[PDB]
Amino acid sequence: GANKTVVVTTILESPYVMMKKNHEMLEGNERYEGYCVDLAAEIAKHCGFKYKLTIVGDGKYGARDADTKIWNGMVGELVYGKADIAIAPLTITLVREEVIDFSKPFMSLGISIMIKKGTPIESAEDLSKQTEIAYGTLDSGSTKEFFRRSKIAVFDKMWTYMRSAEPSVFVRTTAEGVARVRKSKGKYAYLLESTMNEYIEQRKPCDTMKVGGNLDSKGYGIATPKGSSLGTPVNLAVLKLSEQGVLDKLKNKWWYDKGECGA
Amino acid sequence: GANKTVVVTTILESPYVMMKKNHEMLEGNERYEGYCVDLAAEIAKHCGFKYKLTIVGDGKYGARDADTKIWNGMVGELVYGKADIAIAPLTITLVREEVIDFSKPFMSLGISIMIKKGTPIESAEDLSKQTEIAYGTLDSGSTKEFFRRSKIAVFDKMWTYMRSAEPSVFVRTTAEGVARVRKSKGKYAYLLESTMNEYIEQRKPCDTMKVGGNLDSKGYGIATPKGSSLGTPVNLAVLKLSEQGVLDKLKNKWWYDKGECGA
Numbered sequence: 070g071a072n073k074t075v076v077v078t079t080i081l082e083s084p085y086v087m088m089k090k091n092h093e094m095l096e097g098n099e100r101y102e103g104y105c106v107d108l109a110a111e112i113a114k115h116c117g118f119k120y121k122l123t124i125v126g127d128g129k130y131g132a133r134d135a136d137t138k139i140w141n142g143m144v145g146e147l148v149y150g151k152a153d154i155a156i157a158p159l160t161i162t163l164v165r166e167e168v169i170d171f172s173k174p175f176m177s178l179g180i181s182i183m184i185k186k187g188t189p190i191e192s193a194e195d196l197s198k199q200t201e202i203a204y205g206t207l208d209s210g211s212t213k214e215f216f217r218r219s220k221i222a223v224f225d226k227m228w229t230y231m232r233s234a235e236p237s238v239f240v241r242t243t244a245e246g247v248a249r250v251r252k253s254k255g256k257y258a259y260l261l262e263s264t265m266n267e268y269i270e271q272r273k274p275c276d277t278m279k280v281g282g283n284l285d286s287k288g289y290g291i292a293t294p295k296g297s298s299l300g301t302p303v304n305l306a307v308l309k310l311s312e313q314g315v316l317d318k319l320k321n322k323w324w325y326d327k328g329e330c331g332a
Numbered sequence: 333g334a335n336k337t338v339v340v341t342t343i344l345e346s347p348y349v350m351m352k353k354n355h356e357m358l359e360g361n362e363r364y365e366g367y368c369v370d371l372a373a374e375i376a377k378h379c380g381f382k383y384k385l386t387i388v389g390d391g392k393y394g395a396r397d398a399d400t401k402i403w404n405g406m407v408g409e410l411v412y413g414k415a416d417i418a419i420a421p422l423t424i425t426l427v428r429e430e431v432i433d434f435s436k437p438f439m440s441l442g443i444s445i446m447i448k449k450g451t452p453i454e455s456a457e458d459l460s461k462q463t464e465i466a467y468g469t470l471d472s473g474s475t476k477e478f479f480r481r482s483k484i485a486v487f488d489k490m491w492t493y494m495r496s497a498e499p500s501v502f503v504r505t506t507a508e509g510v511a512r513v514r515k516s517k518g519k520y521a522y523l524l525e526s527t528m529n530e531y532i533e534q535r536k537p538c539d540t541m542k543v544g545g546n547l548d549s550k551g552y553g554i555a556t557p558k559g560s561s562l563g564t565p566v567n568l569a570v571l572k573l574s575e576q577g578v579l580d581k582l583k584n585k586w587w588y589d590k591g592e593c594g595a
C-alpha cells in the first residue's frame with residue numbers, strides 16, 4: 070500500500086554508527102553519527118522513503134542458534150519482522166543470504182589480525198604455531214563462523230585452539246576485543262574485519278596495528294527481509310552511490326579524515 | 333520444465349578464458365582454459381547443470397547504443413535470449429543491473445593504470461596534467477563508461493582529453509591496449525581493470541607495471557537474464573565457493589602460479 074516510515078536496524082560500531090557525545094540532548098535519528106548514518110540518509114533520499122534508526126536490542130550482528138534455530142541480532146530483527154532494513158557493517162554470507170536479501174556490497178573487507186604494536190606476529194600462520202599470545206574473535210558474527218567452518222589447515226588449527234582456550238578468547242563487542250589487545254601487553258591478538266582494524270589503527274592512543282594480509286575477501290551489504298519491495302531500489306541506490314563516488318567519499322570522511330595518528 | 337544444457341556466453345580474455353595452444357585438436361568446452369573455465373565447471377557442479385561454453389560473437393563485454401538502444405556483447409546475448417548465463421570478467425554496473433541479474437561478486441577489481449616500465453607517471457592526476465604521454469581505454473566496457481559519466485574533476489579532465497585525442501586512444505581488445513603500451517616506448521599508458529593489469533605484470537616480457545592506487549572499487553558478477561531461475565542457485569554457489577576458499581585458490585592458480593617475472 071502507501072509509503073510507510075521505514076524501520077532501520079543497525080548496530081553501535083565505530084565509525085559506522087556512534088552515539089554523538091551530546092546524544093541525551095538529541096532526539097530520533099539526530100542522536101547518531103557515522104558512515105552508516107550517512108549511508109542511510111543517502112539510500113533513503115535515492116529511494117524516496119522516510120526512516121527511523123534503531124539500535125538492535127541484543128547488540129549482535131546475527132547468528133542462528135544450533136538447537137532452537139532462532140536468529141538473533143540484526144538478522145533476527147529482519148527475519149521476525151521487527152525491522153524493514155539493516156544498514157550496518159553486516160557481512161554477506163551464504164547462511165544469511167538464504168534467509169534475507171542483500172544488496173550488492175557497499176564496502177569490501179577481509180578478516181585481519183590486530184596486534185598491540187611490537188607483538189612478534191606477522192600472520193595467521195605465526196599465531197597458529199605458538200601459544201604465548203592468545204587470540205580470538207567476536208561472538209555471534211561472520212568471523213567466528215569463518216573459523217568454525219574452515220577446512221583450511223591453518224584456520225582449522227586456529228579454531229581448534231580458540232574453541233577450547235581458557236580463559237575464553239571470545240568477546241561480546243569489538244570495543245572489548247580492542248580493550249583486551251590494548252591492556253594485555255602484547256599477549257592477546259584480535260581477529261576482526263579489516264575495515265574496523267584500519268579505523269582503530271588511526272585512533273588514539275595509536276597503539277594497535279593491522280598485520281599480514283587479509284584471511285579472506287568479502288563485503289557488507291544492505292539487508293532486507295526476503296522478497297521485500299525495498300530490495301530492488303536499495304540495490305540500485307548502492308550501485309548509483311558507488312558509481313557517483315559517494316561511497317569512497319564517505320569512507321574518507323569516517324576513516325582517514327578522522328585520523329588521529331598522523332599521516 | 334526439464335533441465336536443459338545451459339548456454340554460457342564468455343569472452344577471450346586472459347587469464348579468464350584462453351584458447352589452449354592445441355585447440356584445433358580439441359572439441360567443445362575442452363578447447364578453453366582459464367579462471368572462468370574453472371569457475372564455470374564449479375558453478376555447474378554446485379547447481380547441477382550441464383553447459384556449453386561459447387565465445388561472444390562480437391568480442392565485446394556489453395554496451396547499449398545511444399541511438400538504437402540495442403545492447404551488444406555478452407550483455408546483449410543475455411538480453412536477446414542467445415545465452416542463458418555469462419561467466420566472464422563482467423563488471424557489475426547500474427545500467428547493466430537494470431537489464432540483467434548479477435550474482436554477488438566473485439572477484440574484486442578497480443580501474444588502474446598500466447605503464448611501460450620507466451614511464452614518468454605515478455597516478456591519474458599525473459596523466460591528467462600532461463600531454464606527451466597518450467592514454468586510453470577499451471571500448472564497449474565499464475572503464476570507458478566510468479570516464480564518460482564521471483563528474484570528478486580529474487576523471488572529467490581525462491575524459492575530455494581522451495574523447496577528442498588524435499589518433500584514437502581507444503582499443504578493441506585488452507591485448508591491443510597492452511601491445512600499444514609495449515610498442516609505444518612509454519608514450520602510451522593504458523587504463524584497465526586491476527585484475528587484468530596484475531596478470532599482465534607477471535607475464536613475459538615483464539615490461540609493464542601497474543602504478544598508483546585504483547581509481548574505483550567494484551567487482552565482477554555472474555550474469556543471467558532478468559528473472560531467470562538460474563540466478564538464485566548460481567548466487568548461492570558463488571557464496572559457497574567464496575567461503576570454501578575455492579575462488580582464492582583459482583585466483584592463485586591463474587595469476588601467481590602463472591607468474592613468469594620472478595617473485
Ligand SMILES: O=C(Cn1nc(C(F)(F)F)c2c1CCCC2)Nc1sc2c(c1C(=O)N[C@@H]1CCNC1)CCCC2
Pocket residue numbers: 160161162173174175176177178286287288289307308311316317424425436437438439440549550551552571574579
Ligand atoms: O566484490 C566486492 C567485495 N566482495 N564482496 C563479496 C561478497 F558479496 F560478500 F560475497 C565478495 C567479494 C570479493 C571476493 C568474492 C566475494 N566488492 C564490491 S563489488 C561491487 C562493489 C563493491 C564494493 O566493495 N564497494 C565499493 C568499495 C568502495 N566504494 C564501494 C560496489 C558496486 C559495484 C559492485
Ligand SMILES: N[C@@H](CCC(=O)O)C(=O)O
Pocket residue numbers: 130131158159160207209210211212213260261262
Ligand atoms: N561484520 C560481521 C561482524 C564482525 C565480525 O564478525 O568480525 C558480521 O556481520 O557478522
Ligand SMILES: N[C@@H](CCC(=O)O)C(=O)O
Pocket residue numbers: 393394421422423470472473474475476523524525
Ligand atoms: N570488465 C569490463 C571490461 C574491461 C574494461 O572496461 O576495462 C566490462 O565488463 O565492461
